[PDB]
Amino acid sequence: IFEDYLDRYLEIQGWESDHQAFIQELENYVSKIWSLEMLLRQAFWSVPSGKFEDQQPIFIYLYPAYVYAPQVVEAIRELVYGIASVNLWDVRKHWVNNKMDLTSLKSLPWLNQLKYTKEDLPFLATVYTTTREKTDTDAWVKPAFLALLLPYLLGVKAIATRSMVPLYRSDQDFRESIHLDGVAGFWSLLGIPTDLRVEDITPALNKLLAIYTLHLAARSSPPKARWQDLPKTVQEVMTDVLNVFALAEQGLRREKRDRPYESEV
């Protein structure tokens, strides 16, 4: 099946062909490949056999914008093998500090003089999350953040999906920067689009961090973020904007504090 798969989909410039081949392609008209590709993911990404939906696997696929130069595909190699498992607790801290400018997010330690030179060059650069509480909103909070973030840092195009098969990108499939296949309902509740053009990505990062940094103030505990409650924090903020202060006040009561600090005001 594989030898026919290259003869169907690979071309090197100047290989001989006749149009007496397309006669056979019609005559044949009158897969095990994706199982082999999944077997490579089990082998080289170290994802589970036979039990995998219960690890809540979300894949972000980083397509190029149009063309990469030889140095930038090598730079994306250093990304996909070296990316940090993101923690939203310090991403909030470095954004509430720095007075809400999302350009601050550029400066955080996102990685873990090339070190990955034996690894394959990433033509389809995929990055993937794992979480250890078992719910969906908890599964989606880090992928949704990463899928907005990486296009803002690197100019790449993201699809975030549970799907092992991607949408393959091409010259006007590229007409959006991000797609998010089937996010938890906190996303639809915020009314942020599931597909974003490149101008919208900083509005999206602002709304997403503003609701994360507001959920983590009240309806959270310092070692346990309780993202299971994020849909209620979104629904009250969207209903009427003064609920931002209702959430502030919930924070104060948890914290056993009767009054805000001058900064929090």
Partner: protein, 223 residues
């Protein structure tokens, strides 16, 4: 002699199972010529049998002169649609399933459809004036297309011969003698792959200063 520029705008999402990959089935970004020819001319020229039975229910009849649904009828009427170039497109991936009609239940798939926000461009060529329909249906879901169509007048066509790059799609099965393909780029598709771009040697029509249409193409001319 006559040439018609047809712009196709999608009025509901269009699905064709062009390639299939696990649970997801997807629609190629070019409408194949033979699909458009039956969408324009089935019932008006090619016969449209409601039922099929036996091998004729599973075997195509594109270029079989014994079977009724043949595109060769169009060769005779002297018409040829080319395949369709995508001008603006978007995709929706939407799931579909089989229904639980019974009170008790114990399959399903994802369609990558071309969406309502989309427009495609094709060209028809004829020996005679043609009453082309302002609505057609395509694909797995018999999905509506608005066709807005203009005849290219003789004040804007010219005829010539030499080497030219066809920026339009083209079907290699319909390629005659007195045209030869020097270089090509292809889009892989049932029932046959198309060229998305090609360099040809032969006769052509400069229908505007930035597109070239191969002259003398007709259904199955290589075959």
């Amino acid at each position: 002699t006559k040439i018609y520029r047809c712009k196709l705008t999608l009025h509901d999402n269009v699905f064709f199972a062009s390639r299939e990959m696990g649970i997801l089935y997807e629609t190629e970004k070019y409408f194949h010529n033979w699909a458009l020819s039956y969408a324009f001319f089935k019932g008006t020229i090619i016969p449209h049998p409601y039922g099929l039975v036996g091998q004729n229910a599973q075997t195509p009849a594109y270029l079989d002169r014994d079977r009724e649904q043949n595109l060769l009828h169009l060769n005779d009427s002297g018409i040829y649609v080319f395949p369709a170039q995508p001008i603006h497109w978007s995709y929706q991936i939407n799931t579909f399933k089989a229904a639980q009609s019974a009170y008790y239940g114990r399959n399903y798939g994802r369609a990558k459809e071309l969406a309502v926000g989309s427009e495609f461009l094709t060209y028809i060529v004829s020996q005679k004036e043609l009453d082309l329909p302002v609505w057609i249906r395509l694909g797995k879901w018999s999905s509506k297309i608005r066709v807005e169509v203009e005849a290219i007048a003789p004040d804007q066509i010219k005829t010539a011969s030499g080497v030219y790059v066809c920026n339009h799609p083209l079907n290699p099965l319909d390629c005659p003698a007195n045209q030869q393909i020097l270089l090509y780029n292809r889009v892989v598709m049932p029932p046959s792959s198309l060229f998305s771009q090609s360099q040809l040697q032969g006769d052509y029509w400069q229908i505007d200063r930035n597109t070239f249409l191969p002259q003398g193409f007709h259904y199955g001319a290589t075959t």
